[PDB]
Design a protein around this ligand. Structure first.
Ligand SMILES: [Ca+2]
Ligand SMILES: [Ca+2]
Ligand SMILES: [Ca+2]
Ligand SMILES: [Ca+2]
Ligand SMILES: [Ca+2]
Lengths: 188, 195
């Protein structure tokens, strides 16, 4: 008679960024070789659930879980609190449910993930007052040099040529003017 | 040859700062040939170095007949920082043109006016398709990207050098190369998603 609850393997360093989809896998085994169901804004497919031989020791049950931390999820300055502590249960066909097993989802601002590369230099007439065409060229050069930042991020250019990269979660990066623009006359 | 050539005086031109324009003269003399022309501006004793004319087909015989005259291509661009006087009646240049034939007759001077205006006076931007935002009081970075892309996609005639900015409320500012602006109010641009 089966009286042994299933065993759950959880990943340990799940880190996510706001507005960006993440994925990870649970691994569940039972001595009978069969796992009936599990219990946890996180999505996963119940395919191959409650099938004989779906959770052997050779081939554990792999539950691909995916979700997205909300773009505007507040992040405390004490980044050890910027995490979700959640639990997962699982039971076999005999009706033996495992204990509550913890997995941690730590969420961070998008600027923690991205370090923007400097663009090719744009030559301007006045370092203190960029024209509209020069600002367009600055934004295009920053975007072309940074294909790894999301397309939904907004790049703005100030009068002195300073670049502000506002990511979809409203976090920011800054590129100073002397990494972006140069006086046209002093270079000729 | 005793009588001077005749120049068909062109219509007055409305030019915009940063926008290239062009037009044509037409000159006719008895000999059929015209040597050179003179282009000067009243109040500008050194002329306009941004207003050019083509010296093509000049002085060659048969270029200025009554049936086939000499068409001179005059082109130029008003500078981006050309000051626009508050009295727009003074925001214009009065040109004058003389023409020599092969012999040496000079024509009477014909005059025409080049009125220059801000670059925004040429453009009346079309409204974009509505961008649905989460909060009219604070647009997201992606919502402003969609607004700018929608305004740019609906206005291919607006110069690519013009910069489109989006405020926190969806107000669109189109800044043209000469720093003149167009404005598209938020009610024509964005809407809240819940409604
Ligand atoms: Ca069991
Ligand atoms: Ca960063
Ligand atoms: Ca003559
Ligand atoms: Ca306008
Ligand atoms: Ca832009």
């Amino acid at each position: 008679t089966d009286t042994t609850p299933p065993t759950i393997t959880v990943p340990s360093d799940i880190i996510a960024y706001r507005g960006e989809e993440f994925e990870f896998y649970f691994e569940i085994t039972d001595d009978s070789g069969q796992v009936k169901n599990i219990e946890l804004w996180l999505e996963y497919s119940e395919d191959n659930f409650n099938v004989p031989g779906n959770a052997t020791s050779d081939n554990p049950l792999r539950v691909r879980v995916h979700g997205t931390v909300p773009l505007n999820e507040p992040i405390p300055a004490d980044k050890n609190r910027a995490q979700f502590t959640e639990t997962i249960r699982a039971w076999d066909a005999a009706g033996n449910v495992s204990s509550n097993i913890t997995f941690v989802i730590k969420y961070r601002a998008q600027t923690d993930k991205y370090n923007p590369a400097d663009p090719t230099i744009t030559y301007v007439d006045r370092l203190s007052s960029l024209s509209p065409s020069e600002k367009n060229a600055v934004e295009a050069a920053v975007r072309a040099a940074n294909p790894q930042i999301p397309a939904a991020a907004r790049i703005t250019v100030s009068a002195n040529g300073t670049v502000t990269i506002t990511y979809p979660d409203s976090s920011t990066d800054t590129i100073t003017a002397n990494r972006v623009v140069k006086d046209l006359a002093s270079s000729r």
